[PDB]
Amino acid sequence: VIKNLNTVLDTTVRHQKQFDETLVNFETLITGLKNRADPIATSVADISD
Amino acid sequence: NVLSETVDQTSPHLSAALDGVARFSETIGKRDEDVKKLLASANKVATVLGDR
Fold this sequence. Notes:
It is classed as membrane protein. The entry lists the keywords ABC transporter, Virulence factor, membrane protein. The entry is titled "Structure of Mce1 transporter from Mycobacterium smegmatis (Map0)". Chain A: Virulence factor Mce family protein. The structure is cut from a larger assembly and holds chains A (49 residues) and B (52 residues). The longest helix of chain A has 19 residues, at 16-34. Chain A has helices at 2-14, 16-34, 37-48. Chain A is mostly helical and 49 residues long. Chain A has 3 helices and no strands. With 52 residues, chain B is mainly α. The longest helix of chain B is centred in the C-terminal third of the chain and has 20 residues, at 32-51. Chain B is elongated, with a radius of gyration of 20 Å. The interface between A and B is medium-sized, with 14 and 12 residues.
């Protein structure tokens, strides 16, 4: 457990800057999509129809 | 007298506790560098998680 957790943690630390930025970027993207979810879902359904 | 009574009562149950504590303490004690490196990397990742 210690060895494998150390491996995963050092892999994450190597990209700590990107791992930190991706949370904020994903939150911004998902919030922006949620604020227009109903038109987006309506449009997807209309495209399929 | 109280110390004598305590040592008389708690002696038969002491060897097993000593053996178990020694084994479990040596589980971590022979991995000190690994444990400390794990704690440092966990500090970094957990700080990233907590800030966001």
